[PDB]
Amino acid sequence: FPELYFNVDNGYLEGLVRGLKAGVLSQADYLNLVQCETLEDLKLHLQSTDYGNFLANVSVIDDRLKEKMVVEFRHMRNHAYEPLASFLDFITYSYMIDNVILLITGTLHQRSIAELVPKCHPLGSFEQMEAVNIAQTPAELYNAILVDTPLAAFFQDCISEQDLDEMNIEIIRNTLYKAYLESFYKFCTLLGGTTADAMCPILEFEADRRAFIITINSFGTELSKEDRAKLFPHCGRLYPEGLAQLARADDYEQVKNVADYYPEYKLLFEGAKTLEDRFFEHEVKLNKLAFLNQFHFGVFYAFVKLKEQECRNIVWIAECIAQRHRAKIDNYIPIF
Amino acid sequence: MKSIIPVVMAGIIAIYGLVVAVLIANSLNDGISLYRSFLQLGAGLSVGLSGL
């Protein structure tokens, strides 16, 4: 029933992002880039794929790759009407949150807005809402400027006077990401059908990475067990019970046995490839599974999280080549 | 086994309807009066809808 529509508005853009899926480097494409020995040979094999002639004009491989996935993402947002344009805006909030914490730091230390253009992610950018460009005021008259930005509703757990050095710089990112993941789950629950069973399993595991990676690095830190409780997103499979036992953990094995209650997250704690290299391969296992379903909006968010894996993998091939340490060159993520 | 007590108390609602249903079906006869039948209609709505 919600499938004989959705091609009225998103018929062309759906076939577009399926066509951009074919430009992802496959397994056979990955093998020939391991056989390279210099960055100039790295330039030659990438001209055989869909990326070609992008280095006509080792850290330039970082920027020229990720600038291609920005303009491909910006071209998709220019044609989505109303059922999808807000959905693509939700993917940019993860990059706007990492941008704004970068901006309140220079605001606190009186480092002006001249550093904003070259040192921010172009996906979540500030080239509209020109009030933020002018603001040099120390983080209290700037929060009144900050609410003219779609991150306003996520600041309802951010008291303005709590911003002035009582909260750590890293803590305010996670409680903003906590406010971000609850809204994007509830927005994807308002949409129903095929975009509610192919997308919400991805958001459950993404909230459960933010369950495990928080508590596994919150051991030597002087943040109490009530702080890491409210930095957990109340979203995934671990919500009523697994979030409770993660607060009392204090030990590496005490976060393992609470992951042993779920057969999905155990057999991923056998990294003993490390843990985040095991969480990444399960994440691209879920984003590949979203490409199965057809008449749904989750094919766009699965494309961006795989396109960031494409820019990640080629650099890791290039860093093993330029530094000439290609005994760990096989430790990439073969997504396709 | 401790958590079966909510679903069996929903099972009481089913046999609450089954008790009334065999009472109305056994009082049925060809040529019952109109006062007899409207009593049975409000009897069926009372156990069913409050049971709903």
Partner: protein
């Protein structure tokens, strides 16, 4: 009817008393030093020694099955090994552990040594036949596409020799039991050596150095002949050394489990001792039955003799305000029936409803009368509490006695479908005029055999059984049973 009555130890009788106390199984050791971590429980270094033998036993029980050896059982509760015998066990346990860990790494290196030398030996015969630089081995399935690529990128040529080896050999992971083929890469040029080595790795060929001069080929063929048969000798001689200690382990591991598992259990209770205080004597605060006070004390008198200690241990009695855990008969055909409650047409309608309602009133009468005998066995907040106590009994028994009316109405459900089931059995199958007595009655009587038990006895039977639990739990155990409970949990054997 338990008591927390104290029991003293002396640490020369801390093993042999407790072990024979753990050879009885009536004791409920209670930890009374909760203000301590999981380590520093007086014996953490030695319980890891039992755990290290546990890790060795869980490892040796795995490798005893991969060689597929039959296991002796001889099932009996053995004698628990003393700490005198404990140090002598780790000499014996690690001897089996270090020998078997070494051999499986040594035999795998020896098997890798055996297949490589036989692969090198078979190329010596076929090339000295063809003779009367690179030499190597490749499988038969990849040889026609190999020479197609070898002609392509070398492109001057290399004069390739094609000769297939006999009955299949096996390199350990690649390839498993395949008959391969030899080849000859002379080419005399010493520049195309780089252009063929990439092809030899691309097609995954295994190459070996040949001596290339006449009569040294047969010289090294005689050398690898004597090397292989000595390697063939020691390979099986490691194997008969292997199986002679697997069956030596097969007479051991079953009883060796319950040696250390009984030791690890009682040492965990040695961690559960009193507060580890100030002298070389211990106290134990256990829960114990009054009917078994004498038998555990003679067992305590038995335990101090088994160590050879001259001083018997004592048993102080006291009284406190804590949980009195329950204990009863625990009979065999009373075990499963107790564990369930421990988990917590017009004329027939008028008669069977009221008599069942009085029967539920009679069941509530026997239940409420048990509350008075239980109360005899031992203002503002009292008004609001007893209001909730009384009127939830008032409107509550109505819903109880209404749920006693179902057990006639479920029998009315039992009666009606049994006739329909019955109707099919008596009517569709047997009332066929011509072809009845054979295939027609056989499938219907099979439905009368198999299809009625899943519907009338499986699902209708379990539901009324689950209803009868509800008649017991919420309708009968709500009158006298307080429902708090605390189990005994005696210190068991297995």
């Amino acid at each position: 009817e338990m008591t927390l009555a104290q029991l003293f130890l002396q640490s020369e009788a801390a093993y042999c008393c407790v072990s024979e106390l753990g050879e009885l199984g009536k004791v409920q050791f209670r930890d009374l030093n909760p203000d301590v971590n999981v380590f520093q429980r007086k014996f953490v270094n030695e319980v890891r020694r039992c755990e290290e033998m546990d890790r060795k036993l869980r490892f040796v029980e795995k490798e005893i099955r991969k060689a597929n050896i039959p296991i002796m059982d001889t099932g009996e509760n053995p004698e628990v090994p003393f700490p005198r015998d404990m140090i002598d066990l780790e000499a014996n346990f690690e001897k089996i552990e270090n020998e078997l860990k070494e051999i499986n790494t040594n035999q795998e290196a020896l098997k890798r040594n055996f297949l490589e030398l036989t692969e090198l030996k078979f190329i010596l015969r076929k090339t000295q036949q063809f003779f009367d630089f690179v030499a190597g081995v490749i499988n038969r399935e990849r040889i026609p596409t190999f020479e197609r690529m070898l002609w392509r990128v070398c492109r001057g040529n290399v004069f390739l020799r094609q000769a297939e080896i006999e009955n299949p050999l096996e390199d350990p992971v690649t390839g498993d039991y395949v008959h391969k083929s030899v080849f000859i890469i002379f080419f005399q040029g010493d520049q195309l050596k780089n252009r063929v080595k990439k092809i030899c790795e691309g097609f995954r060929a295994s190459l070996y150095p040949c001596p290339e001069t006449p009569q040294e080929r047969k010289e090294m063929a005689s050398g690898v002949n004597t090397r292989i048969d000595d390697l063939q000798m020691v390979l099986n001689q490691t194997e008969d050394h292997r199986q002679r200690v697997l069956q030596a382990a097969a007479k051991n591991i079953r009883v060796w489990f319950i040696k250390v598992r009984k030791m690890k259990a009682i040492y965990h209770t040695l961690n559960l001792c009193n507060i580890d205080v100030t002298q070389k004597c211990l106290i134990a605060e256990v829960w114990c039955p009054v009917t078994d006070l004498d038998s555990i004390q003679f067992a305590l008198r038995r335990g101090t003799e088994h160590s050879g200690s001259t001083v018997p241990s004592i048993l102080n009695r006291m009284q406190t305000n804590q949980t009195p855990p329950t204990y009863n008969k625990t009979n065999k055909f009373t075990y499963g029936f107790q564990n369930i409650v421990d988990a917590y047409l017009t004329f027939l309608n008028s008669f069977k409803m009221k008599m069942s309602v009085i029967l539920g009133i009679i069941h509530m009468l026997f239940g409420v009368s048990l509350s008075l005998f239980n109360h005899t066995y031992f203002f503002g907040d009292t008004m609001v509490h007893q209001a909730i106590h009384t009127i939830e009994y008032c409107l509550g028994c109505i819903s109880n006695t209404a749920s006693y009316l179902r057990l006639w109405a479920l029998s009315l459900a039992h009666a009606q479908l049994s006739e329909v089931l019955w109707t099919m059995v008596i009517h569709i199958g047997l009332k066929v005029k011509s072809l009845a007595g054979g295939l027609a009655l056989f499938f219907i009587f099979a439905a009368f055999a198999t299809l009625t038990v899943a519907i009338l006895l499986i699902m209708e039977g379990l539901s009324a059984f689950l209803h009868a639990l509800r008649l017991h739990w919420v309708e009968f155990q709500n009158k006298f049973y307080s429902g708090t409970g605390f189990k005994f949990l005696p210190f068991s054997f297995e």
